[model samples]
Target chain A: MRAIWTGSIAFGLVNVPVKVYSATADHDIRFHQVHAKDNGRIRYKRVCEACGEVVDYRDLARAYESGDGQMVAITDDDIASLPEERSREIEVLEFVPAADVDPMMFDRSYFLEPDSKSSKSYVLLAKTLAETDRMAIVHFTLRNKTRLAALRVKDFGKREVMMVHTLLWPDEIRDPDFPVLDQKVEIKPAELKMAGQVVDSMADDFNPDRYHDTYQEQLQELIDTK
Target chain B: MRAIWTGSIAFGLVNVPVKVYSATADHDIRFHQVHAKDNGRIRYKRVCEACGEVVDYRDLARAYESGDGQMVAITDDDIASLPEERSREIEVLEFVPAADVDPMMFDRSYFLEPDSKSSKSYVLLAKTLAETDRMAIVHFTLRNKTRLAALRVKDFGKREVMMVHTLLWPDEIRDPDFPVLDQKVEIKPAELKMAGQVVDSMADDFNPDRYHDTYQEQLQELIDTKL
Candidate 1:
């Protein structure tokens, strides 16, 4: 995997230079839009509504609205002037108990591999986190977006892996409003007992390998048959 | 979970009203930044560098800079008038072969649950898709972003679940350029055979439930120990 960002993990007096790579990939089958009559490819254009003309991609520039409600075009130089300390460094804020963090807050994950010659410090940090059962909260920027992430040490058999879990802000998670959760409900003891028995009978050790995307498999089979 | 967007699927004299929801959820642990010395929360200020004053979120407005180096403050009215057809309806374009779409183009997936009155039409669409073995190429807008999504029928036990997979634009997919893929390298037949054998030995049916996040489990154990 190619590293999308290059930065260093900083905590106190130590720094571990690392390269960040996205840790997950999707393998779902995809499809395209086409003309129904002639099987021609349907194309989309970036057009200006005011001018009623197709706009060239090169002519695009990032813009932000000023407080006075005036559109101010931001140049690349302007963005470069923004804080780089957070972007270039994984500023470790604190070491917190791993359980204190909630699983729901995480957005995306990345693998941090040592860069340059910081392998020793990187390994030491990973081992320490693993041993202490703590996760490091960090601040960093990737692809122009600032993210607060958790730095955790994971053991993959023989090797220790340092993983970054970018978190969503508290406001991003909406409160549950479903009627099923709010409504008072009760079940009969006999029905509950039967349900438990069924669950017990069907329960088996989870092995990710046993599950498959049966829909995708069937879709593929249909395509092959056709 | 609540529906993020409510809209309708329109195609060929049929409209299946639906509610759009995020199909996947991240379950990774999260934490807040705090000052190490005092155990105080680290707070960020939205300050204007040029003015040297803290800015309020209410004062912030969306702006666009055109190619002519002009900062154009765009009002809510300007955005609302740009386009609405695609944003309000999942208009079916044309259904192409499922294999034709590159897997790399897909970004995120969403579950499309039918609105109160469109259950029959929704099931009809799902059944038609399942029988014809074709996915619908739909155009829809959510949160001001227009998306070209694939409307497919997926099985959830006995029910056929309708799903939409938002696709990334063609330019979004990066070109693969690596020395490994570029250079013509020959491998020994023995090495290839052994590699095939290793893969064969490790081959098993994919059961998503079987795999557990070992890190999360260990971390939970540590937390339990602490408490």
Candidate 2:
């Protein structure tokens, strides 16, 4: 895979050349915006309504809400001002058993392969992690930003794999309370017993293969027919 | 982006090396299959039910299920079996005004880029199609797979872009007659007119930037705060 973003895993002073790749692609009912009367396609621009002007890449500044209906515009200089001492390095904060690390903690994963002759230290770290049967929790700078990542061995149960899970901000997560589910179901004693039995009977060893991308396959077939 | 399939596009006796790419990415809520006991990860394999044997990449074949439940297998030979007259050529079978083609006929799209050496010819096609006010109905093969594509010109400033839209199968559509749109529903005429006016007043060109993947943004935001 071609790496979309190239960076190093940084935490406690080890730099590993890594490539970030997208794990998925799109396929679903597609739509295009068009003129209702003429059926012509619509054009778009990065427009600022407050100024009634279209902005280009050079004119935009990334900012965040400081709270209470306010904006604090952030400039590239602010990020650059931060120390690079932690940059280009995956600082190891702690080592924990791979099983203990919640899979939910991972954000996105990228394979970390050594890129230079200085990889001797990286190789040593990889070997140490593999021996411990644990994944390393680290923070690193990537894409001019920083992210939480995990270094774990892949495929090998005994070997540590590189798996990074980014923690979700509490406010960003979808609360379970949104649109409540059907909490009450009419169930007799036999109904509950049958449900349990049926579920158990259908339950087989977990395998991702049987769970194919049935929709992608169906769409591909349908489109191929054209 | 890695080209999922790479080959060439042929039209009017000219062949240009081209590649296909996915137009977008999906972000949908997904369920995880976890161990009932401990929520452990699961591993999977492809298996043939009849032989009860694991099937690998080499063992697969594309097949079609007829309406009657009959299975008809489609082979590489069948895909490549089109006559030379029917193969590799993206014949502009018909040049209809761009406005004439129904939007429903369009489907998934890809950017048909010209291989390094064919850049000149690619530019010629892009400009020609733009000036002629037409979209080309073309056929080409990539990775031994044949497909129908709509070639069009995308002008982005001084750089003109070329894109290939994979037209969808019209037959896949179900009749819309089943919807009960004609049912008489009580509505105040003023309310209806006001609703239409409100919709019209709010209408504007689609601004893709305004519609960032909110879910994904939130996902990253969650990660950022934790980190």
Candidate 3:
């Protein structure tokens, strides 16, 4: 994988220069739009809603639409002026128990490679995180958006590497507001015991290799038959 | 958002023709790699480890390395023969209480738009989900990956729409095996009551618009200073 970003991870007074590479890849078969009746490729044009003419992508600008039906066009200069768009440092905010970070908050993952001649500081940070069972909460600006990310040590069979996972803010997570949860349905202790037993019976260490994309396999078969 | 996929949602004998659009967008500040000392752009070359020669992308083929370091090159035909890659149907497996699905299982979100001229079936599915408080468990192939996804009705201010959210498999989530959790601990009812009270005091409905990326603002300030 190619590096997507180059930056320094700042913690206390130390700076670890690193390159960021996405930890995941898309392996899905891509499809293109086509006319159903004629079997022709369907091409889309960016047309202005206010006018009948087609609009070029470069000519389009970002705009904010208000509830009052007002559209305020924002220029490229306005976006460039934003302070976070130019940041190269992933600044550590604090360290907390790794368990405190919920899987629900995880958005995207990236591997951090040490860019300096010596990987001493990088190794030190990764080792510290592993020994302490802690994750560094950090704030970093990327692509014009600033994100909250967690820095943790990930094991890759042969080695341990520091990985940064962007996280959704607390407000972004919807509350469990189902009225069913508020009904005070009491679960019997015996039923709970049975559930625990079932869970224990099926419990096994997670092995990613155990599962395969059966749908993809089926789809491929369908395509071959067609 | 542009529609990424066009297909039909199949449940029982009913099929709702739809277009799928991604529900989220990235707004992160992007940066390019450059030399720290001279500020020159940094570029990389694909080099063969065995021959110490630069390789072109088209000449590259995926290979799996065994435990003993034996490499087996996998051909495109080998991958194309896989059965699941061509499925277009979003087949509903079952329906479960929305609350039964944990947030941790959610991976990606997509909005399902009614594609047919008549949207009666689409509206029927969305309304049924909203009224029943249930999510349809589904299996569908997107790109080449067949994913377990949840079909639910989402509130989008003025209208309610059917949304599909891809879920991670059970094996994908790591089991929490912290030693601290294994230790027996006791909490008094009074302590639990106090904790509940504290939670109630702070609890409020979530508002997505209330949050802003402050780090972006700070970075912009830093850049302005340099300019």
lDDT, each prediction: 0.53, 0.45, 0.57
Best by TM-score: 3
lDDT (Cα, tens digit) per residue for candidate 3, span A1-226:
3668889987556788888876655544444332223223334344443353434555544433334533344445655665655677887666666555444456677777777666655655565566666666777667756777877876654445777788776555443222221222334456444434332332233233544566455544544441
TM-score of chain B of each: 0.81, 0.69, 0.83
Chain B TM-score, model 1, reads 0.81
Docking class of 3: incorrect
lDDT for each residue of candidate 2 in A130-198, tens digit (9 for 90 to 100): 555665555555554555555666433432324444432223222222111112223345544443433
Could you tell me how far off, in angstroms, the CA of residue B94 lies in candidate 2 after the best superposition? 2.6
The order by descending TM-score is 3, 1, 2
Please say which candidate is ahead in DockQ: 1 or 3: 3
Largest lDDT belongs to which candidate? 3
Once fitted onto the true fold, the runs of candidate 1 whose alpha carbons sit more than 4 angstroms away are A1-226, B34-43, B61-81, B85-87, B178-180, B188-191, B222-227
Model 1 C-alpha lDDT per residue in residues A1-226, reported as the tens digit of each score:
5678787776555677787776655444444332223223234444453454444556554432234533333345434444543356777655666656534345566777776642555555565567656666666666655656777865655566667877654434433232322222344456444434332332233222333433344434544431
- TM value for model 3: 0.54
Superposing all C-alpha atoms, what RMSD in Å does each candidate have to the true structure?
A: 18.1, 29.9, 14.1
Ranking by lDDT: 3, 1, 2
CAPRI-style grade of the A/B interface in model 1 = incorrect
